[PDB]
Structure 1
């Protein structure tokens, strides 16, 4: 999959277009890894998977997500406030489809306001525009 020029330029229209695009998220990830903030995209996808994946795996998936992104000192510990975390940790006691909505929104805005802006000005994105068919 090689994005056309119009498609890649569209990633700059707004964050929603970039992250809602498979190739966009892949390009954005290369950038986040560069800034050591890849856990945010990892967490966002884990949430999307939990919500629209096999609804019988919710419990397992939620436990795994907690262990990887929420537990104090987690390998991919995410940057959310105490309240949001409290809300999430309580909800996880009794898992469900949208139990990570609060945390996911916070992390979404985190990337949009901070990482996204720099992404559009990075060499990585300029190159995506270059190789654009």
Structure 2
């Protein structure tokens, strides 16, 4: 139960491409601090909830999909995040008959938004640069 301390190589790998950063627990954790600094923190919370919906306990899928919608996407939602019209339409139409992939269109849209609007800036930020400088080569 040791604290996960990323090696230099691992942290450098987060700069290889967006999927390496987001698919790494410590990478997401670091990216999350930066997203909150840039006021778009809920984007990653939503992405993770959708990942769980997809590959998680499948007996509560129908229930979880609606919960996620009400928590992140509905008007006035507590953890509201914006998605475009075409995406919302597909999501709402899909929710009339919930299934494992009902939120995939929304999750992908948010994924591409983070990749397009935040990934590069993150790598150029003090948070990443500090993470890299502090990580050491064993």
Please give the TM-score of this superposition, normalised by the length of structure 1. 0.96
C-alpha offsets along residues 103-126 of structure 1, whole Å, 9 cap, x if unaligned? 111100000011111100111101
- Would you say how many aligned residue pairs link Structure 1 and Structure 2? 133
Partners of 1:106 and 1:78 lie apart in 2 by 12
Deviation, 1:72, is 1.2
Checking the alignment, whether the CA contact within 8 Å between 2:73 and 2:82 is kept in structure 1 is no
C-alpha offsets along residues 59-118 of structure 1, whole Å, 9 cap, x if unaligned? 221111011111012122222111210110111121111111111111000000111111
Instruction: Tell me the secondary structure at the aligned position of residue 69 of structure 2.
Output: helix
Please give the TM-score of this superposition, normalised by the length of structure 2. 0.93
C-alpha offsets along residues 2-42 of structure 1, whole Å, 9 cap, x if unaligned? 00001101100111110010000000001101111011101
Checking the alignment, whether the CA contact within 8 Å between 2:54 and 2:101 is kept in structure 1 is yes
Checking the alignment, whether the CA contact within 8 Å between 2:54 and 2:100 is kept in structure 1 is yes
Unaligned runs of 5+ in 2: none
Unaligned runs of 5+ in 1: none
* Match in the other structure for 1:66: 69
Partners of 2:118 and 2:100 lie apart in 1 by 27
* Match in the other structure for 1:125: 128
Checking the alignment, whether the CA contact within 8 Å between 2:123 and 2:129 is kept in structure 1 is yes
- After the TM superposition, list the runs of 4 or more consecutive aligned residues in structure 1 that deviate by more than 3 angstroms: none
